[PDB]
Design a protein around this ligand. Sequence first.
Ligand SMILES: CCCCCCCCCCCCCCCCC[C@@H](O)O[C@H](CO[C@H](O)CCCCCCCCCCCCCCC)COP(=O)(O)OCC[N+](C)(C)C
Ligand SMILES: NC(=O)C1=CN([C@@H]2O[C@H](COP(=O)(O)OP(=O)(O)OC[C@H]3O[C@@H](n4cnc5c(N)ncnc54)[C@H](OP(=O)(O)O)[C@@H]3O)[C@@H](O)[C@H]2O)C=CC1
Ligand SMILES: CCCCCCCCCCC1=C(C)C(=O)C(OC)=C(OC)C1=O
Ligand code: SF4
Ligand code: SF4
Ligand code: SF4
Ligand SMILES: [Zn+2]
Lengths: 208, 115, 63, 156, 54, 144, 176, 342, 96
Amino acid sequence: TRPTIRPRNDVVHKQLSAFGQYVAEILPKYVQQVQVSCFNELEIFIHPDGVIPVLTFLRDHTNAQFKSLADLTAVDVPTRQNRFEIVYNLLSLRFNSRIRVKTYTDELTPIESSVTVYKAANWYEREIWDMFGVFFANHPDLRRILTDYGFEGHPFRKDFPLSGYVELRYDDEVKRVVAEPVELAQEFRKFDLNSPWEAFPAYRQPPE
Amino acid sequence: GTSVKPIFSRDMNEAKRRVRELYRAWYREVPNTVHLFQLDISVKQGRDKVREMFMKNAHVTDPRVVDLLVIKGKMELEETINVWKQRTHIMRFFHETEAPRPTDFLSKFYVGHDP
Amino acid sequence: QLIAVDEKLDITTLTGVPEEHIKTRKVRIFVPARNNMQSGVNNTKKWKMEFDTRERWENPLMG
Amino acid sequence: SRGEYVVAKLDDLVNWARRSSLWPMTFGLACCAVEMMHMAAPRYDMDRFGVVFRASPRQSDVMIVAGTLTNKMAPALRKVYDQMPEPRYVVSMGSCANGGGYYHYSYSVVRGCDRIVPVDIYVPGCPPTAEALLYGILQLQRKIKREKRLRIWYRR
Amino acid sequence: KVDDAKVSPPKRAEMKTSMESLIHHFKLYTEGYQVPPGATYTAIEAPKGEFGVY
Amino acid sequence: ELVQVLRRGLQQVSGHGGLRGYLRVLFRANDVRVGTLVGEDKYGNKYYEDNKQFFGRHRWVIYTTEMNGRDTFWDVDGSMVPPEWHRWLHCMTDDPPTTKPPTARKYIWTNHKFNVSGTPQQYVPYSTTRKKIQEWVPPSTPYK
Amino acid sequence: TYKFVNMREPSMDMKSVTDRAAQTLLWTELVRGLGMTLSYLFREPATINYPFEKGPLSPRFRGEHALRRYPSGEERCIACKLCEAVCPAQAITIEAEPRADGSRRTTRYDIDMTKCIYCGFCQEACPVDAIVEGPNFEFSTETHEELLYNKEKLLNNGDKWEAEIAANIQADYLYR
Amino acid sequence: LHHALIPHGKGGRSSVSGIVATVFGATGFLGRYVVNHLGRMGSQVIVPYRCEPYDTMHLRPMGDLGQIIFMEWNGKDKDSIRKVVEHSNVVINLVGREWETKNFDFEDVFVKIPHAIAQVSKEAGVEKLIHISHLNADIKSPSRYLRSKAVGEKEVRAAFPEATIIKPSDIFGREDRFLNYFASMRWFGGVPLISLGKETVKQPVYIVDVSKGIINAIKDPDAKGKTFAFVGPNRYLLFDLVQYIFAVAYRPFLPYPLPHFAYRWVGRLFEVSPFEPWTTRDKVERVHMSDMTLPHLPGLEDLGIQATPLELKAIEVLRRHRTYRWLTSEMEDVKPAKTVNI
Amino acid sequence: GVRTSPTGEKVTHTGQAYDDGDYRRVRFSDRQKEVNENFAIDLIAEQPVSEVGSRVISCDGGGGALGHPRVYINLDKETKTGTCGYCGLQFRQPHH
Ligand SMILES: CCCCCCCCCCCCCCCCC[C@@H](O)O[C@H](CO[C@H](O)CCCCCCCCCCCCCCC)COP(=O)(O)OCC[N+](C)(C)C
Ligand SMILES: NC(=O)C1=CN([C@@H]2O[C@H](COP(=O)(O)OP(=O)(O)OC[C@H]3O[C@@H](n4cnc5c(N)ncnc54)[C@H](OP(=O)(O)O)[C@@H]3O)[C@@H](O)[C@H]2O)C=CC1
Ligand SMILES: CCCCCCCCCCC1=C(C)C(=O)C(OC)=C(OC)C1=O
Ligand code: SF4
Ligand code: SF4
Ligand code: SF4
Ligand SMILES: [Zn+2]
């Protein structure tokens, strides 16, 4: 090991495992999985119905006190039946700790809005709806945040093209900015970078 | 059963009701949009365009998809009413600058390789 | 309580994709062939979806 | 000819007046504007050349596009360009404004501000240094010095 | 930089002298280094507040 | 110490070659300081230094009045500085190209050119590759 | 370990009360601000006399791109295309073929200067020191097309700036 | 077809149309629309300009990189014309002035310059030539402007037999001198009309219609040696047309009759301006001249264009001429004028 | 080693010149065509062939670490000289 290798922390790993067991015991109705990564990060995979209870428990419970919502985002995996992975990152100042809560949904199933638990979620949820098209029920004001007015589609979906479908230019005949189908003078050049040799034997999958 | 959670409507009838309310709102709004944005089109053109945008999705049979379409249309209406959109955003519905692309086989064959 | 929809999934009206790029596209689903220049087989594990090749032309100013 | 001499001298006078007093709009978009802020800083002191920022488009002469132009922002840039009274000039500063730069292949970025407005000077860099921007403004001054509006009118 | 040529590029003198250094320079500047699968949230106290990457 | 600064002003007047030189430098460079001459270009630019000035004002160039083809009595720009004095002037080195001349190569430009944008000498991009697809040439004789 | 920034109590004796009243009525801190500005007025300004005086740079400065040659005049580039692969903005376009003498050389080497982010990754990736970012930074144009550099423009840049480029590389190459 | 000149792409900004067009007089009213329509589809456009380069800047965003090239030219110099038409397969002529200066009269701009352009294009190998004339061009016309148009079109047809001649009638648009002229006539209180404008008939045509007609004539193979007349779908009396113009701009309409000689004297008085005259004797002549009917010529419908009625496009020209109180009034509010359609 | 095409256009070191009927020549009107005059093939053909007394020579382009990766060239064939694949310098064993 020595100099070039990142060191381990067994104390934090044990503490996070114990707290994950604690949370899983307290909420068997919604918790589906608990994980602790090799770099000491605790993840809790829950059922979509438990978004409001679990988060509430992690905010108001005396032993958790995860009072800060550091980040809320989505991850798109097209190969899954439930396309979108909703990820919450929470920080507890009282116990100087961080936790991750992960749930799932598809294009047509709404997720409960968390603005009653964390106000900071508001814009975050908007961004998810803007960037992936996931609808959040009971959002006080849900609408586009990052994209242009009238923009069609959700650009952070993996099947959305990198350059989109339309581009803008000023047209002098109508004396205004117009949108037209995209044409690129130089097409973006796709690179095939993956090596045909396996890099990490520890992550090898069964041959099916 | 397929065990699917609704968004707003249980079946297609309440979805059609919501569609009708959204259509009423857009139809009422069109003259105000024409006046405020100072558009060269008439109210008839705007209402015909609203009808065309509504009929673009007339084949949908899933109440959840209809609910999401109504949500998006309400978002667009709220954008239009508050003058968050500009004249260019409204006029993008009419494609006044794009040349008319032919539909018959012969013209596509003459022009290029696209099907 | 659930509503029990009974129709096959269709999200074409929600993705904002233009019409031409739905009904005129043909996607190929395949496991990519091994690159014959190498013996490694790590790139022949997953399935890929790709679209049909359309026209590319030379740019007049730069080529 | 006396008339040709008179119009040439008047062209000289008006060109000197217009290039010695260049007022760019207070207008920046991204990291490039920071370097623009370093061109007004004491080391370079753009005000010593007669270059003064003015917030109102009606009271400004130059548009410096310092930063990426998105599709959501293009109508506003075109609007505040149109509201500049003439004669007006546009300086494109940085790779993003010149041709898109690092975000050229994005879905939400205009690939160069010259698709929206005519451009007089292109200042390369990511970002261009404050000295490079000063060189760009001095080159624009020279280009304005090369103008012959009244001579063209007289020869019509 | 870390003395691990599978992650950090070698010095230019070694790249022009040793076969392994040239191979690793080539591969690090064409393909890059593979990162083991996983997700992290890493935050710092940036001058404007907590700045993070998931 | 007022008389001292007045005498320094008169010395600056006298060190520029008379009143005409003082006016020429005032209206050409907006500066009338006097420094030790470091060297001259083959194009006519004179390079001066003054180590008592703070970092940034301790090196400067009085540009020539006549570069490759244009009159530069008023139209001067930083692109007229040749690369060797460019390295000296921007403080990337502490040695003038006089005491430390650059390395001579047969392919190096023997004549520096400034920025030529806006002139008939400007660079025009073009594709430098050959034609890719060759068309079939029909025979020039009749077929019946 | 922390400190407080705004947790001090003013003393309530008659002397302090009179001092604060005189401060309110006679504007002493405003006079202090005026004095600070007046002090700055008589300081020497930090302005340089551009373009006659130039800002300081470094041998590591990344400016206009150039293509270099060997001392014999042969091109250093061998069309390995590492710079094209590493370019974060895809600003480099390269085509190559065997030369009439069988050498490995480029037939097209274009850099889109309006796509470039001027990061210097290309000159790091180059194994023969063929492509460099030169010291020049004053190359503003009047048209967009003039900033689309082909191989001839880059070779001319190299031939024009080689004297300074070689010196900068000689000063820097022991850190690389 | 010279492989480099083979159409490619989807027909947009980055495509290749196969058209290399030299557009004389591209810095005017019709020229900007023609250049925009050429640059939309990816054509190579050459702009000869005599004005100050600042006056060409609005043409720059009209094309992709390298697709619009500006070169200086001189009308009285044939070498300039040859230089600007060397590598083109299409030449369009839009050079024209509605008044006479001390260096160029109507003969210079409508006869000599078109003849030089046509002859130089013919000897340079240009395949297609488009020349613009007037619908009311007449050798016996009272106005000098139409006599010069007739002579110039005869000379151009002599020099370039395969040329396409297009004869529009009083184009109206945002930068026109037709609707803006009558709208600006409000500054004098009353509107002076010869015979109250009751024996004059107009058939104005939309600017976009004329530009698309020119583009289609370039792309039409049968339109090589033909002559076209570009007119609008409706015919109006001058009185009703001016009344409708003032009604759309919401200005008080006070028409009064002015005798022909007095109006000619007024035009001659306004001709003395060293700048662009507000009106001329020739302008007074042409305003009160009835638009000819030429049913033997092909029109916009023969080039696939449906003529746009004025009642649909007049608001985009005359909303600028309204006061603040009437700026937001809609297009369908002003009751289209009566039309004498045969 | 520049050469002028029959149209007056300089032929670049890549051999590219517009055809007499190519419209793109119009881009050079009122302007110039950028051509580099130092053709590398002629310059590398100008160098003499170095005589060395070993079967294998080493070349790094000169300048130490400032050149190209160091390579080894075999010199067993007398029919042809050994050419460096990077810099183009030629080497040979003494003959005749
Ligand atoms: C009386 C009220 C009515 C009139 C109101 C206006 C009054 C007249 C304006 C005063 C004129 C003075 C301006 C002249 C300054 C020129 C200075 C010099 O720099 O110009 C040079 C050459 O001069 C210009 O080419 C022409 C300017 C001279 C104008 C011609 C004289 C015409 C006077 C006619 C007055 C009539 C007024 C209207 C009467 C009805 C070009 O140098 P430049 O590139 O910049 O500087 C480079 C920067 N460096 C030096 C640091 C390197
Ligand atoms: N306007 C109308 O209602 C219709 C006009 N058409 C015809 O169509 C043609 C163009 O129309 P339009 O654009 O409206 O007219 P404009 O006056 O608006 O533009 C004329 C163009 O021709 C150029 N030009 C004029 N005179 C000269 C000259 N002596 N030398 C060089 N160039 C010159 C102008 O360049 P610059 O800017 O430098 O002066 C300008 O680019 C004209 O011939 C006109 O007669 C005929 C029917 C009516
Ligand atoms: C007068 C002192 C110098 C002011 C220079 C004004 C520059 C205007 C650019 C607008 C702008 C401002 C104000 C600004 O503060 C900022 O930082 C967030 C920007 O992003 C870089 C900007 O673009
Ligand atoms: S060019 Fe570079 S520095 Fe300038 S705004 Fe764009 S990304 Fe920022
Ligand atoms: S500096 Fe960076 S962006 Fe520019 S060409 Fe080199 S690698 Fe590409
Ligand atoms: S410049 Fe260097 S890295 Fe790029 S292709 Fe040439 S030799 Fe390879
Ligand atoms: Zn070698």
